């Protein structure tokens, strides 16, 4: 599914993320742009032969199992194919896991060089929220 800008800013104000762990919708609907443009079929391969997956470009090397991924982690407990869903719950959920391991949203390397620092209110202006 691609989603609608204000579209994706009410799902994810539905599941929560407005705020979470003090990160404004702004800064989560920044990162799904430029991760996915709002597509939550998106895949990416990494240098290390980790795949990125879904509207967060949630990656194999920690968070999902995708079958092809030597000596990583699942610490999100799903398929990666999960995160491709037109339902963003599982995306959402292991979005907040990984927003919690320390680094915020400097996790999302898109994030810190697109985002942060920038006015990420613009990406919600105009929505009914
Ligand atoms: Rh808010
Ligand atoms: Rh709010
Ligand atoms: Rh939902
Ligand atoms: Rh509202």
Redesign the pocket.
């Known amino acids: 599914k691609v989603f609608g800008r204000c579209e994706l800013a009410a799902a994810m ?1 539905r599941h929560g993320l ?2 979470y762990r003090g990160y ?2 702004g800064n989560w609907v920044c990162a799904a742009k430029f991760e996915s443009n709002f597509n939550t079929q998106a895949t990416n391969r990494n240098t290390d032969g980790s795949t990125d997956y879904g509207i967060l470009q949630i990656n194999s090397r920690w968070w999902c199992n995708d079958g092809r991924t030597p000596g990583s982690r699942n610490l999100c407990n799903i398929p990666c194919s999960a995160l491709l869903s037109s339902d963003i719950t599982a995306s959402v959920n292991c979005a907040k896991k990984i927003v919690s391991d320390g680094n915020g949203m400097n996790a999302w390397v898109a994030w810190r060089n697109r985002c942060k620092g920038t006015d990420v209110q613009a990406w919600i202006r105009g929505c009914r ?1």
């Open positions: 104000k407005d705020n404004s919708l929220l």
